[PDB]
């Protein structure tokens, strides 16, 4: 007897597509290009890794299933699985050192590597673990993930901070020019204080998994790894070695200039006038007067774009310059229809909030004019 199970296409494709996603294309060592299939009892367990992240998905098997474990090329399996007609039943078994995929009038033969070639995750015990709604953890990542740095160096900037303090879980992300942070409360005890820095590629992956809009995920924070367990999936990620800076000392303190405006009209006007801004720096000029915002941009060809937007503003007069992409990025994640800007002077950072709550906060440094 050998490994043999039977599964609907849609039953298999849902986790296989996710698991295959973390599997890098054409790795040095061949096993790292494969998904690990394990049948134990009536359950199928697909595991993929890139030596930084390990994703595991599980499917119940409705029919009989003789058990076993083997690894098979992830992409080819997924490509095959998706190319099959809707609702058809797939037969998967091992013969010799090959995987035999039959479904309808189609027969596929993939080349396998042994289950013991697959690396095991050397994960120890948690230092703190809790549960939180998938929607809440997804909100923390998505409301701030845009502000992470984009280089690959193993430095705190190229990752998101997850911080547990009081009864609240907080995400923080910054690239040195802008910062995004979001904070919600959860069923964590209050004597708890602990930080982890999840790398950029990993935390963006974790957000992609938190799709059950009404589900719950179990988080475990350790010295070197972080575990997300959703009953359908088990996501594991190495951490960033190093301490995250005192992000609190980056939030601006003395803003006497409140600007309330329409989120969309600002995004559209910033984006519009940027067409004639400088391609490298993408700087625009904000010119605040009483109840008015005058936007200006110009480029080396001495082309120029102005646009006036009516806004709520009863403060002083201020002229300030910003990298328009930083502004559009913040406006991209603002959920409310109105947006609040808190400025001080032309050379100090801007603070952006949503209209009706301060759970998420965004700091954007300006440009010298």
């Amino acid at each position: 007897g050998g490994m043999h199970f039977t599964i609907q296409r849609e039953a298999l494709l849902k986790p296989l597509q996710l698991v295959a996603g973390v599997v890098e294309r054409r790795q040095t060592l061949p096993v790292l290009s494969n998904v690990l299939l394990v049948v134990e009892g009536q359950q199928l367990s697909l595991t993929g890794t890139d030596l930084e992240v390990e994703l595991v998905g599980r499917v119940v098997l409705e029919d009989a299933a003789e058990p076993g474990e083997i690894t098979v090329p992830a992409r080819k399996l997924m490509d095959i699985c998706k190319s099959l007609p809707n609702d058809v039943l797939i037969d998967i078994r091992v013969e010799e050192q090959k995987l035999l995929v039959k479904a309808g009038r189609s027969r596929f033969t993939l080349s396998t590597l042994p289950a013991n070639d697959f690396p095991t995750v050397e994960e120890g015990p948690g230092s703190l673990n809790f549960s939180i709604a998938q929607s809440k953890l997804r909100r923390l990542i998505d409301r701030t993930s845009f502000a992470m740095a984009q280089q690959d160096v193993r430095y705190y900037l190229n990752g998101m901070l997850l911080e547990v303090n009081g009864g609240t879980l907080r995400s923080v992300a910054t690239d040195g020019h802008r910062l995004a942070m979001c904070s919600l409360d959860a069923q964590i005890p209050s004597q708890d204080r602990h930080q982890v820095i999840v790398p950029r590629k990993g935390i963006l992956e974790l957000a992609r998994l938190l799709t059950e809009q009404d589900g719950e995920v179990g988080i475990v924070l350790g010295q070197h790894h972080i575990r997300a367990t959703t009953g359908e999936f088990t996501f594991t990620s190495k951490l960033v070695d190093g301490k995250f800076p005192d992000y609190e000392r980056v939030l601006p303190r003395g803003g006497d200039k409140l600007v309330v405006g329409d989120r969309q009209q600002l995004r559209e006007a910033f984006s519009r006038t940027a067409i004639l801004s400088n391609e490298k720096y993408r700087g625009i000029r904000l010119q605040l007067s009483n109840g008015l915002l005058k936007i200006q941009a110009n480029n080396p060809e001495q082309e120029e774009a102005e646009e006036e937007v009516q806004v709520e503003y009863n403060g002083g007069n201020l002229e300030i310059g910003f990298n328009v992409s930083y502004l559009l990025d913040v406006l991209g994640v603002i959920g409310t229809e109105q947006v609040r800007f808190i400025l001080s002077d032309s050379n100090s950072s801007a603070l952006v909030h949503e209209a009706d709550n301060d759970d998420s906060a965004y700091v954007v440094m300006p440009m010298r004019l």
Partner: peptide, 10 residues
């Protein structure tokens, strides 16, 4: 192009 007051970093 000034940065946020990160220490170190800027």
């Amino acid at each position: 192009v000034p940065t946020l007051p990160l220490v170190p970093x800027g």
